[PDB]
Design a binder for this molecule. Sequence first.
Ligand SMILES: [Ca+2]
Ligand SMILES: [Ca+2]
Length: 162
Amino acid sequence: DEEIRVFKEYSARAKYAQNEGRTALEANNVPFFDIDVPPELDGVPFSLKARVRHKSKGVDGLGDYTSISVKPAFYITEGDETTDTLIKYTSYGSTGSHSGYDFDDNTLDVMVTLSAGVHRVFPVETELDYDAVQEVQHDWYDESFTTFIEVYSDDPLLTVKG
Ligand SMILES: [Ca+2]
Ligand SMILES: [Ca+2]
């Protein structure tokens, strides 16, 4: 069995966000999930992933051939869920028009090194595309063309075996 530890699934489009700290993102209703890092993973790098869908064609009335640059990230509290400082994690960028075919879904795949205890994770889109700004007046904290279908880990360090 190739085990998968699911952390969360999201149906809503992820919001554009710069690294403005935990309080700012929560104020703007950026959904999150918490990960409780156990003592045996205290300060130990592990793999965190997301199934990511980019879909731009006609979204908010955007042109079907408009090129949209994307770069999803996790923003994760360095301290616990009550602290503000966030660390940025990215792994890929993509560009051009996006149809959002499930067989084209991308994978954010990062190495995360965290202290023991709870950390809050914000799945976000970090790239605000200028064509989007001009065509459909997208700005920071608007819903982007990026959706975190599922956040997960297939790292044996995190999964329940079976
Ligand atoms: Ca296995
Ligand atoms: Ca563009």
